[PDB]
Symmetry: C3
Subunit: 30 residues, 3 copies
């Protein structure tokens, strides 16, 4: 499961990056 674990971590990091972008947009415009 070594590659599968890295794939799951990358998917989580991609979700966290999207959430940070949404938080920055809220700060910029809100």
């Amino acid at each position: 499961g070594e590659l599968a674990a890295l794939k799951q971590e990358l998917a989580a990091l991609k979700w966290e990056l999207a959430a940070l972008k949404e938080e920055l947009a809220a700060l910029k415009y809100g």
Copy 2:
């Protein structure tokens, strides 16, 4: 295969992280 796909995803995530940093910095300095 799987390792090539993970390498490509990591490269894209690093590019989008740099883009987020630049936007955040621009907001902070502005």
Copy 3:
């Protein structure tokens, strides 16, 4: 070697995203 390098990059990106979360919280507070 490539798997080890990708694991190291993903671990670093976790810390980078946490630091960006802290910067966004500071912008919220400022």
